[PDB]
């Protein structure tokens, strides 16, 4: 199954997510993840930053966030509405795990 948590890390605002993300699936690790805003249609790369994944908008980011995953093996996991507008930093938000 995958097993996901998004921790809001320290230097977070408003127009910027930075998150500690820890995704496992047996076998398999991420390769891409996308930031839906809520009432938006499009997927916004996250960008890969060492232990740590991040999203800058010029405008404020509105929640609550959807996350689409790639794994490198090619498994599609969407987590919807995870994180709040009114995140917290420090907190981590944990989804349900999702069995294939
Ligand atoms: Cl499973
Ligand atoms: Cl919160
Ligand atoms: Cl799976």
Known sequence: AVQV???????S???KLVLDIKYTRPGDSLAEVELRQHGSEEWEPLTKKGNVWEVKSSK???????????????????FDEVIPTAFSIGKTYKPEEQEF
């Not at 948590?5 to 230097?11: D, E, I, N, S």
């Open 60 to 78: 404020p980011l509105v929640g609550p966030f959807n996350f689409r995953f790639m794994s490198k093996g090619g498994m599609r996991n969407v």
């Open 13 to 15: 605002d408003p127009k």
């Open 5 to 11: 948590t998004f921790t809001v890390q320290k230097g």
